[PDB]
Amino acid sequence: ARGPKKHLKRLAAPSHWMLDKLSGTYAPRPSAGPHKLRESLPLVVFLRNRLKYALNGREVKAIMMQQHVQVDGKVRTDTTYPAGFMDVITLEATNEHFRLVYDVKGKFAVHRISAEEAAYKLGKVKKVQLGKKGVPYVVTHDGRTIRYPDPLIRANDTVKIDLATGKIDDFIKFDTGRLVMVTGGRNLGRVGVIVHREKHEGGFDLVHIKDALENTFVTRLSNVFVIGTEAGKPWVSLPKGKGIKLSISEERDRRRAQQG
Amino acid sequence: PRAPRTYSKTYSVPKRPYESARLDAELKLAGEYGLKNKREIYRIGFQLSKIRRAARDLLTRDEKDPKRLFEGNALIRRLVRIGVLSEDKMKLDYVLALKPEDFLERRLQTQVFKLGLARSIHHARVLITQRHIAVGKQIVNIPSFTVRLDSQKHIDFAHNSPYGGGRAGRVKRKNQGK
Amino acid sequence: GISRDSRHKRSATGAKRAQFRKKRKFELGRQPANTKIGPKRIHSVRTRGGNQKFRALRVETGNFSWGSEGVSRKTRIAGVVYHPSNNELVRTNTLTKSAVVQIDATPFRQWYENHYGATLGKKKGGAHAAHAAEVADAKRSRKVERKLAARSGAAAIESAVDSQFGSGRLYAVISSRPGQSGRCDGYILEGEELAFYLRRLTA
RNA sequence: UACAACAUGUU
RNA sequence: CCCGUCGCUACUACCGAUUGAAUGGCUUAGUGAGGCCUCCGGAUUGGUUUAGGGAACCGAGAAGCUGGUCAAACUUGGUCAUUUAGAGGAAGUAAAAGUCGUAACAAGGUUUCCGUAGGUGAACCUGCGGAAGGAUCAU
RNA sequence: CGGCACCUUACGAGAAAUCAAAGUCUUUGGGUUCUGGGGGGAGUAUGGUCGCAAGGCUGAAACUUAAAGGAAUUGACGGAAG
RNA sequence: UAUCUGGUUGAUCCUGCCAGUAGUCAUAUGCUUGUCUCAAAGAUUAAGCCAUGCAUGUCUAAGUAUAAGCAAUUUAUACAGUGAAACUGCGAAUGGCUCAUUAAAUCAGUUAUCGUUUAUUUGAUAGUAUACUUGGAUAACCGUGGUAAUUCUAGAGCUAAUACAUGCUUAAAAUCCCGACUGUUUGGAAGGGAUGUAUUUAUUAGAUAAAAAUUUGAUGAUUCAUAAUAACUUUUCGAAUCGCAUGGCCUUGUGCUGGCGAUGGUUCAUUCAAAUUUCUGCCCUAUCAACUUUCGAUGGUAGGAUAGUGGCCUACCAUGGUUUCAACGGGUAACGGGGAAUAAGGGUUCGAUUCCGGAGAGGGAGCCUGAGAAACGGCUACCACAUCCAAGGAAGGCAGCAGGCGCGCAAAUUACCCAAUCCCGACACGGGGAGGUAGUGACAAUAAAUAACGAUACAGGUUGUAAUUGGAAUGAGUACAAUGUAAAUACCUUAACGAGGAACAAUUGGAGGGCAAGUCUGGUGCCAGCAGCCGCGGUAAUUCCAGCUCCAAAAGCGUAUAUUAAAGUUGUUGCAGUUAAAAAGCUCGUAGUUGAACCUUGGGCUUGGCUGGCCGGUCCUGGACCCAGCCGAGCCUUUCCUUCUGGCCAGGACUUUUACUUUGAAAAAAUUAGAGUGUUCAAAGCAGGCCUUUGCUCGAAUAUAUUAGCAUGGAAUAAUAGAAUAGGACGUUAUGGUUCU
RNA sequence: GAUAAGGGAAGUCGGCAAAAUAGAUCCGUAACUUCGGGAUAAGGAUUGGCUCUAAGGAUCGG
């Protein structure tokens, strides 16, 4: 209606933000940027509701105006910056680094990482084609474009991006037996291994996956994310839970095992 | 605007307003447990009906059905922790035999006159209302407060009441002047 | 104003539709350019997205292509001889896409004479044959003689195109959209396309 | 052969 | 027990001269504001710059003008939907004890009823052909 | 073999009268068409349509009302019989 | 909780409705009203009309400061800080409100863009064949002013840019074209032109059947990405901008160099979005049966227009398109959905309204600006309303917040504030009737007082029962105080007060039946009145008016209307049609619905998993084998399973269509169900809990969605096609004739 | 025998007299009806000149 929307009603906010019902009418509308509005995590949410450092949004703006917050090695002054999957969040003044990675629950868990791992990020390759002057490039899932990629890099492959230089360190081929993580749908956050990729021309590609506990679960190819070469060896640190799904009885038993 | 907050009704009036037998039954229950109105019986009837409905729905399922194994055991846990069931009736079959008195016996008022803190159940309710009763170290002024099995032994008087280690009320402080 | 919506039309069943909203700006249309042959007059239109079109009101010259020879020159449009959509456009000399025009053959004659060292037209006119004979033998070095000799063989053009060069006006078809790009470009008619349009013109 | 009709309301 | 006309009163709807009235939509035809495009035009203005004093010469450009295009609005005629006044006329229904008869219920004192056609204060009667839901399951 | 019917019983049906179908229908399902939804107003008004006309077909609403009605029982009554 | 009761009769069994009963995020109204928590609220009728105030503005060290502004005398006689005005930039297209229009439209779920535009964000991305830095306006400001009047503005005088308009600072080679001369059997050249990116057109790349007479990206798919040639263009842009620090080199020149940022700008990608779009799905109506095509209706070709596809429009041409499987027309007291109530199941009804989508801003239409609007707290015009006036003229749009009038059965303050939620800007600072806070507020919901305990005399048959005798208990209310808050108010804590008629006094409807509770007293006398229904009332009224007593629910109870269950009184599940309502007078007959049986059935072997038992191995766990049973898999029986090539995956050439049923992906929250959790309980909320701090810690589950669509096993059931004038199937290694790749 | 501002039957027994309409092409056309009509109902649009274009034929020749 006459132009772009700028507010976001609280009940319309994504369900993985864990926003309370009654705090107010509105929710932070994530800015335009490297990740989709629905699949991102605005920084105000991360630093207020998750870390609990700031008590309110005005304190989030007080924090970020002093260069404290960095995403992928760059200072951001945007209270509503669209941080998304694999993004590295660094808090220098507290000397603390984070990576936004889905948990098995379907949420952007708070994941502390070391400083040495907080120097790169994975990226799923969406497309490759030649640009101006015949130069080829690939596009990652966070809107990053890298010129002169390896002649073998194709779609759905994952590249290891060096944050300081934005260059490709190394890449993983998409094939059977690859350690992957599901980035959409009902199986959000669960880590498995590729078993069989099923092709449907003109339609949708399905990918059969298997957990460390042998349960097979199928997912759209669009929701897959290659994260490791083989079983048990990812290139990034995993959330507390290893991306493994437990039944409700199992989680009840483990809760009563650590609290009774 | 802000999202709407949920609210529900916790009772239901009878379909037949003037059945004499059940009128006498409700009067007996109120008199035995010192209730204020018939709506207090309606609320426990509501709770009991929904609990029995849940048990019945779970009992339509096989003993091996996972939904039964989770929800039925949660229901049993809630019932056996509030005092309605003992440590020998955990099968959802004894959940169907519960009566309003089972919940009436687990109220604050009933347990207050059972322990000995008050003579009549009416005096028990009257003490509960005037903030002379504390569960743990928390003053409770709600007679429908249901005490759990791991809360029965901590019912006693409040430290600030004249019945449990407090000063004198205005009546005695005016009557001590002479 | 002019609207491109489909809601004002009848249904495929023939039903009359009811109005659903007022006219929107994102569904507008504008007036046709109706480009004529004359001194250049190009107007600018600000379009959706802040973009910019050029409406050719009058144009003298255009960029025309000789397809079988791979060279394009900026020549002069002489007029319109045929238009498939409407003969009134011919009658008023309106330049649109697909109109069949005559352009001045001069620049193409210079290119071909310089490139293959021959002549076009086959008109042994009084003063014409003087030019033809002079073009046949000019002041010319030796390596260039040899390169022209190698370029012969691929030097004769088809008779139908050749016969036109005696008039200085070659048949052509506009390929650009003058009302949109502001330019009037095209290609030389050759082959069965030329034969088809000659058949239409002779009527 | 002939023969029309029977005020209101109950207990 | 019960039928209709008649008498008093009340309510509902119908027909009805008034080429009745109003409201909303669509629309032929005529007129047609104002934008937009287009065509000239040229208050004024800087010099494509050059003039011994400036003399040839370029760029911007207001009012206004031509031709189109979208088209409000008004006038007339048509059309669809809804509401609505009316002398008078013809019904329906309701309302303790008004009038005339007694048509039905018994073979209701001419068995009753159906269709059709006449007649008559009223119920109704009569002709023709049916039915038993008959007053005959039968000679 | 086809028919028009009839007699007995009550399988089974039904509110009963009665029914070899009105049975095989709460143990509810072979296929299919039409019709009804308390009594009146009313088969009326209106529009349409057919008819020479008489009329036929299609066909409302306002409003009004606590019953109207079916089958059987006992009694009473009959210008009904014994 | 899959339930009924009263009413036709003297009595009966039915049909059948009336009445009773319970619910409503369902409206109004009457009476009554103590406490805490929560919370709807001018939709219904009039998308009716509006006085007045407010609701949209915005500056960082980093665009423009000679304020005749304040401050500093300090790092400074080009400015330097703070800071009005104004120019420039951005926003004002979000939000909020309402439901008038709208019935294949909106919308929902699914698609598509190989059919397009996209500010901003985020990534990339350009050495191109006067320059120690160009102009000349203009605002603010001074001054002269005109009009009754407006956010009216005019002469005249100055003066800036990231405004306006121009303009160089640049590498190294190589490639293509013309080519004076020259060497001369095809060569060297002087001298000229063209090289980036945008625009437009044409033409070339953008590959891939295996034995005798050379390498290239993506897609299911392309004329895709990209590259090349020839030219084209009222020649797009490849920085005449700003703030901090200012270091390094010596060939000391006011030399050369160079750190962190601001703002820019071409293209692509990305993100925020738009615009069109596939499939299927809407209430009533035939007292609407044919509709569309004059003046686009359905399609074709070419063009124009658009951001782009398309009869979107134009020209020419064809005669098409929809329809009883309900088109077209009419009505809607119709915005759609997420959802709500009721609820055995199946259903019935509601959804203006907290979220999503659409549409509008009194009614129409047309536009400017801008990335984005056919914007109305923008403009233009007309219509209708409505305002000021000095009579010449000028100014408007509350379906934003509050408020008024009107309308009506029907709905609150012209309050406080940006503290929270969040949005906007040049921005850490400013703004926001968005939002939050209070006022009104018996919409709805949660909890929950109005009394409790003794002894005397009684009494009973051991306390169940009695008046009059005392002492306590306390919250309603008030109020220091702190807390709560932006400031308050209230809650919560709390000092001093605060109960005998504890007058600090509970009401609303009833007392013949349905239906719980009087034949007690007085009044009236078919009157007055009651009574949902049946009925009551005529001088002994359990029914009216009252008193007493009793009953039901209680801070609530009654009434009216709509609706749901009861209703198997709408019936597919699941009604009825001889006589209660209801079989067409009777046959023909199209659409619709529905339609006899039949085609691989039996047998054998091997073998995987589960249930109970002989082995028992019992710690509910499991073991060769056996008794059984169920559900799988493989071969063989004339054996169905596409055919050939690699050699139980990976390739070419094939494929009769469906219904049905299984399984998956995917499918906003809120709501529903439901797990956890002492909000003091509860409604609720999504919190919270611990060894006691420089901390740690579980969580914010889990199911339901699926008509339609997309994937996917089965092959019964019901259809669909095949070989009959054979124009029929296989010949792989059967032969020939032609012809193509 | 003509014309007449503004009004338009107020004139008069009465629109008497006069005015208005008028051909042709295309569009559109109510009540009612003896189904034949009413009907040119009512009521709209068009029409010159010039320069062109298209369609509609006859007789010969296979």
Ligand SMILES: CN[C@@H]1[C@@H](O)[C@@H](O[C@@H]2[C@@H](O)[C@H](O[C@H]3O[C@H]([C@@H](C)O)[C@@H](O)[C@H](O)[C@H]3N)[C@@H](N)C[C@H]2N)OC[C@]1(C)O
């Ligand atoms: C049975 N047929 C009757 C016919 O007999 C006649 O009956 C009247 C009846 O209508 C009168 O009754 C009527 O009129 C009286 C009063 C206004 O007079 C009303 O009180 C009463 O309610 C009303 N029904 C009654 N009083 C006498 C009968 N003969 O009325 C006409 C009729 C309906 O056809």
Ligand SMILES: CN[C@@H]1[C@@H](O)[C@@H](O[C@@H]2[C@@H](O)[C@H](O[C@H]3O[C@H]([C@@H](C)O)[C@@H](O)[C@H](O)[C@H]3N)[C@@H](N)C[C@H]2N)OC[C@]1(C)O
């Ligand atoms: C409800 N209580 C009952 C009540 O039924 C009463 O009713 C009779 C009724 O049956 C009489 O009887 C009437 O019954 C029907 C029908 C309405 O019942 C009437 O239509 C009819 O006039 C008459 N037969 C009538 N005269 C009124 C009361 N006396 O009979 C006595 C009673 C105890 O008062």
